[PDB]
Amino acid sequence: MHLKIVCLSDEVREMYKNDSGLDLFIVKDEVLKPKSTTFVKLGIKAIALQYKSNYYYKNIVNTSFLLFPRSSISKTPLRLANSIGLIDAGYRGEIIAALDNTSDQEYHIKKNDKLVQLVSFTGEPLSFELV
Amino acid sequence: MHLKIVCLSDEVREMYKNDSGLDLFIVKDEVLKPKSTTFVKLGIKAIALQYKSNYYYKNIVNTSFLLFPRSSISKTPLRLANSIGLIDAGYRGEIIAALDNTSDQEYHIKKNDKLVQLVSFTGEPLSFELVEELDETSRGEGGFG
Amino acid sequence: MHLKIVCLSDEVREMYKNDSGLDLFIVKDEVLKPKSTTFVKLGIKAIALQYKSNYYNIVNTSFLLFPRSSISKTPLRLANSIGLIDAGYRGEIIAALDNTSDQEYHIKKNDKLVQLVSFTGEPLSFELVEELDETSRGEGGFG
Ligand SMILES: O=c1ccn([C@H]2C[C@H](O)[C@@H](CNC(c3ccccc3)(c3ccccc3)c3ccccc3)O2)c(=O)[nH]1
Ligand SMILES: O=c1ccn([C@H]2C[C@H](O)[C@@H](CNC(c3ccccc3)(c3ccccc3)c3ccccc3)O2)c(=O)[nH]1
Ligand SMILES: O=c1ccn([C@H]2C[C@H](O)[C@@H](CNC(c3ccccc3)(c3ccccc3)c3ccccc3)O2)c(=O)[nH]1
User: Fold this and answer.
1) DSSP character for A75?
2) Does an H or E element contain C28, and which?
3) Hey, are the CB atoms on C79 and A73 less than 8 Å from each other?
């Protein structure tokens, strides 16, 4: 699967320029309140491209995709609130992690953290480019 | 993917006789107790149909499908207990959202809330039609009585 | 999709010598501390084989670790929601379990909290194998 990632600032641009899931960065440092849900914005828009398939309903196409937590989230108190995000074919907005902080204390996330990852429905290796 | 949905009452049939995720309705008002897991019955049974694929094991078929939370559940204190529901190919039971209330007060869900959605393993667009039975079995809602 | 599983002990092998999800066993009795997350080792390694596709004849493939429906009736939740096991991976399979309760939680050998699933949702078969490949982490090769 092929991703077109529009980075939304220059600082993020330099993150991405500088295997069935594609990691995303935590873009700005942030304190997560205790016992909370926080919509962390990821500083990108994306589209996923695949070959057309024939499907039961009653060239390359625009496809839907998935935001999975990274295994390593399990070592933090943070959980993805909506379990696995579903990002529809038509979505053109910023890509956001819904993160629950399950701890009684605040949690500091920092630019450079990869908590989350993009994945294809079919689990096929991922490729991307900027746009 | 194409779903065939059996509505378990006229009320639910009305809701449905009126996208990569097909949203499902909360079908009865209900209170979830604080700090609880509640099995919320969604008033439907369903069969998913896809084109026959060739697969490594060593036309139009029944297929497995997925039950996902909605994005917007994020804003509530409710979480899907089993992360993502896996519904096997010939499952004929009622569809159920196992919902954790993570908060310490009650949570009132309401007829027409949409917490949860059905999704194909391929992430392809979903259709559905309403049907009276899934098969001839009493669990499919079919056959004699 | 077809799985080859290496059982890391004879005990584990006996349980596996004795449908779109393949249930995996709790392999040893364990107490999980209250309000914690525990990396529970499942005593197996696995590889998944499917038909080569074409993206944008038989291939080694990535796969999914799902909670079982019945996990819902316990206080135990999957930390990472759904675990993604990459095609390359040769380590022991681990379930990261959040004990959401105030009390210790006892899991027993032969409990089944978690299951393996295909990215396609297709029916799963499996066999037991002594190695995944020739590497040491794959448990194969000289030694
Ligand atoms: O994990 C995901 C899942 C979906 N999406 C998508 C494509 C979806 O339509 C869209 C859903 N917007 C919200 C939102 C909507 C309704 C109510 C509350 C929040 C959202 C919810 C959860 C996670 C991410 C985003 C949202 C809107 C505005 C500000 C914050 C959050 O983003 C993500 O970007 N990440
Ligand atoms: O999210 C899901 C996932 C699966 N299913 C399916 C197809 C699955 O085999 C089957 C599993 N029924 C139970 C259950 C089984 C064993 C132990 C405890 C509960 C269930 C569990 C979690 C969520 C929903 C349903 C269930 C059965 C009877 C009464 C309540 C709950 O339903 C759902 O309907 N929704
Ligand atoms: O649910 C899953 C998901 C992935 N994996 C795989 C394939 C992955 O690369 C790899 C990730 N190991 C850890 C880990 C990774 C990074 C940082 C800290 C821990 C992990 C994380 C979540 C769940 C299970 C395992 C891990 C390694 C050693 C000891 C404990 C935890 O295991 C699982 O076995 N189960």
Assistant:
1) G
2) none
3) yes
Could you give the 3-state DSSP secondary structure of residue C24? Answer: strand
Q: Which helix (H) or strand (E) holds B98?
A: strand B96-101
Q: Tell me the CATH number at B83.
A: 2.70.40.10
Query: What is the rounded distance in angstroms from the CA atom of residue C115 to the CA atom of residue C141?
Result: 29
How many domains would you assign to chain C?
A: 1
Q: With beta carbons under 8 A apart, name residues in chain C contacting B64.
A: 20, 121-122
3-state secondary structure of C22: strand
Report the 10 Å Cβ neighbour count for A104.
9
Please indicate, yes or no, if residue B143 is contained in any of the structural domains: no
**Which mutation among B67, B96, B118 tests ligand 2's pocket best, with the greatest number of atoms within 8 A of CB?**
B96
Residue A75: count of CB within 10 angstroms of its CB: 13
Q: Are strands A36-41 and A60-63 parallel, antiparallel or unpaired?
A: unpaired
* C5 domain residue, yes or no: yes
Experimentally, how was this structure solved?
A: X-ray
Domain extent, residue B50, equals 1-131
Residue C141 lies in a domain: no
Q: Considering only CA atoms, which residue is closest to atom 30 of ligand 2?
A: B39
How many residues are recorded in chain B?
A: 145
What residues of C are in contact with residue B83 (Cβ under 8 Å)?
66-67, 77-78, 81-82
Residue C137 belongs to a domain:
no
Distance (Å, rounded) from C-alpha B59 to C-alpha C36? 48
Determine contact, residues B44/B26, Cβ cutoff 8 Å: no
Question: Which contiguous run of DSSP H or E holds residue B120?
Answer: none
Chains B & C: contacts with CB separation below 8 Å? 71
Q: Which residues of C touch B100 (CB under 8 A)?
A: 77, 100
Instruction: Give this entry's resolution in angstroms.
Output: 2.4
DSSP string, C67-113: E-GGGGGSSEEETTSSEEE-TT--SPPEEEEEE-SSS-EEE-TT---
At A62, which amino acid appears?
Answer: N
Contact A53 B119 (CB under 8 A): no
User: Which residues are near ligand 3 (CB < 6 Å)?
Assistant: A 71-72, 74-75; C 39, 65, 80, 83-85, 89, 91, 93-94, 96
